[PDB]
Amino acid sequence: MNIFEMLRIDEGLRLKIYKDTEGYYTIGIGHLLTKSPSLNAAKSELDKAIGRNCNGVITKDEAEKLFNQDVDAAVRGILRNAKLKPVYDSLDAVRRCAAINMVFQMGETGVAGFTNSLRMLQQKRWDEAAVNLAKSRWYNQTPNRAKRVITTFRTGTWDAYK
Ligand SMILES: Nc1ccc(CCCc2ccccc2)cc1
Numbered sequence: 001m002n003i004f005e006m007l008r009i010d011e012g013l014r015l016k017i018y019k020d021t022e023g024y025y026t027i028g029i030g031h032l033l034t035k036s037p038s039l040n041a042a043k044s045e046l047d048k049a050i051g052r053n054c055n056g057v058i059t060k061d062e063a064e065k066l067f068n069q070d071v072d073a074a075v076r077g078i079l080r081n082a083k084l085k086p087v088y089d090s091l092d093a094v095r096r097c098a099a100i101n102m103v104f105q106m107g108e109t110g111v112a113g114f115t116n117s118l119r120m121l122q123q124k125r126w127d128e129a130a131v132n133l134a135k136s137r138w139y140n141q142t143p144n145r146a147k148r149v150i151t152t153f154r155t156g157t158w159d160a161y162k
Helices: 003-011 039-050 060-080 084-090 093-106 115-122 126-133 137-141 143-155
Strands: 014-019 025-028 031-034
Touching: 003 060, 003 093, 003 143, 014 039, 025 039, 025 060, 031 039, 031 060, 039 060, 060 084, 060 093, 084 093, 084 115, 093 137, 093 143, 115 126, 126 143, 137 143
Parallel strands: none
Antiparallel strands: 014 025, 025 031
């Protein structure tokens, strides 16, 4: 198991525009296109992302290209973030994957919330961090996925994905 296999489990693969768990137009392996309710706006974003006229449909190769870019972008965002980088650097490789997973799903908009979770993770207080992480809109709205990610932070193993 690695971050690509982990996020492929959590996000799936769909080759036509679909709505994500929040109702937002998405394609591929969890590639968010737009939060606008306009399907036309989403199709424009898709064409811009692929560099061709797609009318809402892509191939698996193209979905995987966006996926590689999106994982890369999540990592690079963690490393540029003054609050996230020290915690990320403090973690082992498996727990780093859990961190990338959360930033893939939610961007960096939830860093100020999760301040306390971040401190517990840096302190390696794993059971306490797991309790705090679950006290969240994230957990309530996507509980099965959050439970998998939280188990990964708690244990440093892939048990929740096997
Ligand atoms: N949006 C959002 C972004 C970040 C978090 C913090 C938990 C994940 C993480 C843990 C360690 C290092 C980097 C990221 C929560 C919400």
